[PDB]
């Protein structure tokens, strides 16, 4: 570290070396902090968290429980142990609460004066965050699993939703139309995700193991669908180019958005060009994950080397994106892990899971 | 070694009730070397996974005695404890399955009393406990 500082300080390395290179060890050294708590407020399991992109300062929580809880992630104390209180929360006597589990919830991204969140009462809820009440309500004929707004259109606010129905929903926030659909998948849409590069590239991932890259302005179906084996085992597609072995619940494009990451239930975690949908053929083992509905994991930003957090059973599981090799097992939890959210900004993580609990890994010295 | 010795003079179930003076036979010699508890746990875990419901009472409460008095088990149960934190959680929880769970409907009461006082006896940092508390209260308690 002091070669370091001298490097940076004598024009040796560039200090994006430093800043990269620190971030690796402090990601390396990521551990569960019991010197920062989360304050406890679901009665159920946490199923999303989704820190806001901009200042990364708050977090929302979405719980089985129905409600949704709005934390500080700042230490506004001047202590060294502090607990991320909670801010706001759509509580059980909240008019707008969801009726059922929330499954996703996500800030608006460009500003923190919005966020959506999707439930299986079959609602999508865009939510004032000042105010605190529903701008917006869109209606589903069936569960929502998924929702996304792309984190990098200027242009067009659509939200992706993958519900149990075959069809992807895309439901445009700006004048209210939730009519267009992406057909070409056969079972629940267990994920939905744009590409943090293109503004118009959507992957959804679906029960029925495929995953398709679709290019939302096109008239003419997906671009690619993703093939475990690209092409030694080839068919005229009708059952042929399924992404896993089962189902595909999760999906997280890297941070330049060059590849896709896509997580199934045949306990297999795949990467792939996210232009021609091609398996990079990186091993990654095996990455149990059994559940039932979207499983939602991230990826590491402004690090050396990109990391992949992946709820692992209880656990979180740390991989490294480009060649496999599996990090570590954040082990700090008591049942299953459902969401992992990264704070970019300090290389902290926070995991919610079905124990009604958020825990922070901070890195240690 | 000792360690051993003491164990099989007390987790005995020809006479299964709490002993006081070996047991604080076993806290001095804790006290005395650190090492002798990181095997206990060893040791512990021998009689947890034993077909005996009465040795699995005996290494239980050895190891909160160990824990809340020698001061070497309580840097394994509230540092490095995450298999502390498993062990509650495959105990009074359901073991994973196929493998059912094999302790009797006593030993659960007395693993969920134990946690009750745990979480008030030592949960300066150590929250987990409270929290599995909460599972179990609301998830195979």
Redesign the interface.
């Given at each position: 570290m002091l070669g370091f500082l001298s490097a940076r300080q004598t024009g040796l390395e560039d200090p994006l070396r430093l800043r990269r290179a620190e971030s690796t060890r402090r990601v390396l050294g990521l551990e569960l902090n019991?010197?920062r708590?989360v304050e406890?407020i679901h009665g159920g399991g946490i199923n999303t968290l989704d820190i806001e992109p901009v200042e990364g300062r708050y977090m929302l929580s979405g719980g089985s429980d129905g409600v949704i809880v709005l934390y500080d992630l700042e230490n506004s104390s001047r202590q060294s142990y502090y607990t991320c209180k909670a801010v706001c929360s759509i509580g059980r006597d909240h008019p707008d609460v969801h009726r059922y589990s929330v499954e996703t919830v996500q800030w608006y991204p460009h500003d923190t004066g919005m966020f959506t969140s999707s439930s299986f009462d079959k609602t999508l809820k865009v939510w004032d965050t000042n105010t605190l009440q529903t701008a917006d309500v869109f209606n589903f004929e069936e569960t929502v699993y998924s929702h996304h707004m792309s984190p990098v259109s200027t242009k067009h606010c659509l939200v992706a939703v993958g519900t149990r129905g075959p069809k992807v929903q895309l439901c445009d926030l700006k004048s209210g139309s939730c009519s267009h659909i992406l057909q070409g998948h056969r079972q629940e849409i267990l994920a939905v995700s744009w590409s943090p590069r293109y503004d118009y590239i959507l992957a959804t991932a679906s029960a029925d193991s495929r995953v398709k890259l679709w290019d939302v302005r096109r008239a003419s179906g997906c671009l690619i669908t993703l093939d475990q084996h690209n092409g030694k085992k080839s068919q005229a597609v009708e059952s042929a180019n399924t992404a896993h072995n089962g189902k595909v619940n999760g999906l997280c494009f890297t941070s330049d958005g060059l590849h896709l990451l896509t997580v199934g239930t045949d306990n297999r975690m795949r990467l792939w060009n996210s232009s021609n949908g091609e398996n990079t053929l990186v091993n990654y083992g095996k990455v149990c994950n059994n559940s039932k509905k979207g499983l939602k994991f991230t990826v590491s930003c402004g690090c050396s080397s990109e990391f992949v957090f992946v709820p692992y059973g209880s656990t979180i599981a740390v991989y490294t994106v480009y060649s496999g090799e599996q990090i570590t097992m954040l082990?700090?939890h008591?049942?299953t892990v459902d969401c992992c959210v990264f704070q970019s900004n300090f290389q902290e993580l926070y995991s919610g899971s079905r124990?009604?609990?958020i825990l922070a890994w901070v890195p240690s010295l | 070694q000792k360690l051993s010795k003491l164990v099989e003079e007390l987790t005995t179930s020809g006479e299964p009730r709490l002993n006081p003076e070996k047991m604080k036979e076993l806290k001095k010699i804790c006290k005395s070397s650190e090492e002798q508890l990181s095997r206990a746990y060893r040791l512990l875990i021998a009689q947890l996974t034993q077909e005996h419901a009465e040795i699995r009472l005996s290494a239980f409460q050895i190891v909160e005695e160990l824990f809340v008095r020698s001061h070497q088990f309580r840097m394994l149960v509230v540092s490095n404890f995450q298999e502390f934190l498993e062990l509650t959680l495959g105990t009074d929880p359901a073991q994973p399955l196929p493998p059912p769970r094999e302790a009797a409907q006593r030993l659960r009461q007395a693993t969920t009393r134990a946690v009750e006082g745990w979480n008030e006896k030592f949960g300066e940092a150590y929250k987990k406990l409270a929290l599995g508390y909460h599972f179990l209260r609301h998830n195979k308690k």
């Open positions: 019991k010197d708590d406890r082990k700090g008591y049942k124990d009604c609990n | -």
